[PDB]
From a paper:
Reconstructions were also generated for the other six symmetries and complete ring models built. Rungs are maximally constricted at the top and bottom with internal lumen diameters of 14 nm and 15.7 nm, and widest at the ring equator between rungs 3 and 4 with an internal diameter of 17.5 nm. This unique asymmetric curvature is a feature of all Vipp1C11–C17 ring symmetries. The analysis of different ring symmetries, ranging from C11–C17, provides us with a view of the structural flexibility that enables Vipp1, PspA, and ESCRT-III family members to perform their functions. Furthermore, as each ring comprises between 5–7 rungs stacked together to build a dome-shaped architecture, these asymmetric structures provide us with a glimpse of the structural features that enable filament tilt in the context of an ESCRT-III-like polymer. Based on the Vipp1C11–C17 models, where helix α5C is positioned at the tip of the spike, α6 helices likely coat the ring outside surface and do not contribute directly to polymer formation. Consistent with this, Interfaces 1 and 3 linking the top two rungs were poorly resolved in Vipp1C11–C17 rings, indicating a weak interaction once the limiting geometry is reached. When membrane was modeled into the Vipp1C11–C17 structures as a 4-nm bilayer, sequential constriction was observed with the membrane lumen reaching ∼3 nm within Vipp1C11.
Proteins that perform these functions include Vipp1/IM30 in photosynthetic plastids, PspA in bacteria, and ESCRT-III in eukaryotes. Here, using a combination of evolutionary and structural analyses, we show that these protein families are homologous and share a common ancient evolutionary origin that likely predates the last universal common ancestor. This homology is evident in cryo-electron microscopy structures of Vipp1 rings from the cyanobacterium Nostoc punctiforme presented over a range of symmetries. Rings have an inner lumen that is able to bind and deform membranes.
Residue numbers in the entry:
A (entry chain G): 53 to 104
B (entry chain A): 26 to 155
C (entry chain B): 1 to 52
D (entry chain B): 105 to 155
E (entry chain IC): 156 to 219
The structure:
Amino acid sequence: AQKRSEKQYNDAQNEINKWQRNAQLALQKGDENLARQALERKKTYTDTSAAL
Amino acid sequence: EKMLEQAILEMQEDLVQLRQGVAQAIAAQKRSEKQYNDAQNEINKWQRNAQLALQKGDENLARQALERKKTYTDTSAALKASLDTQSTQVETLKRNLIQLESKISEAKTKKEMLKARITTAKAQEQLQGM
Amino acid sequence: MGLFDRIKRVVSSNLNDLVNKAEDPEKMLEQAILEMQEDLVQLRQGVAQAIA
Amino acid sequence: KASLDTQSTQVETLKRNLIQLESKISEAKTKKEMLKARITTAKAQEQLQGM
Amino acid sequence: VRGMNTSSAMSAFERMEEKVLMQESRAQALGELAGADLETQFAQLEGGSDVDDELAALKAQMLP
């Protein structure tokens, strides 16, 4: 169970990194809405990570 | 674990039903818009006819067309009012779905926490036996 | 609710026996790959009709 | 003509979806081979671990 | 695309994941318990002690 939570936590961290890259990419693209959405997703992931 | 597993299956099916309702609402908005668009198109045709009627010299036909336009306008206004009310409901449904999506993920996390405490309790029971 | 309590107990007992038999990994993997391929063919036919 | 344009757009969307679907099924086949190896290792390990 | 409950792709991934996760976690955990025991740790130390003396003996054997 500890390993599973760690994997999920690790996955969340990995997911957050991917999301961060996308947000940066979104800014370059010029789509403001997508970048904002990504930030919200990261916050949700962070909350999940905190809970984990 | 059995109580938790049954609950997870149940929530997913409910979400699908909500999605279908949202689709119907979306379709309804589109249908009203099409009717509204059709009414606007119809009004334009009516306006052309009224102008044509004046050229023709038939005063009665032109007057009749104006009355028809007013009725169409009233219908369009009603459709617009309906759309606004429908839109607020649609937004709430969309918001609810987003909230639900966040909630299901939390439920999965809860199960893991629940499983860990139960295992610990079982370990304590073993100590009593000794 | 009395009915609700009865439903949960009956459902749990039935579900547990049923899940173990169909949880084998090898049987599940074979079934999934075959099904998706069949679906694609059906989808293609529908698409072809639209194109026609 | 108006009907054709709407239908054509829908057809194009379906074609795009099919391409996406094709990518997904191929990935699944690769996953099965990886999954099988992991399962076999675990079974062997469990018997050894108990002893 | 939406991912229906009855869809084969959605169902297959979920079924496979549950079985795979449990098996992988259990195997790793079982291995860890053996490592945790003190006797196993002592054996590793003994093995390290054992290899060096043999090497010294081997050097003596190959010295002439």
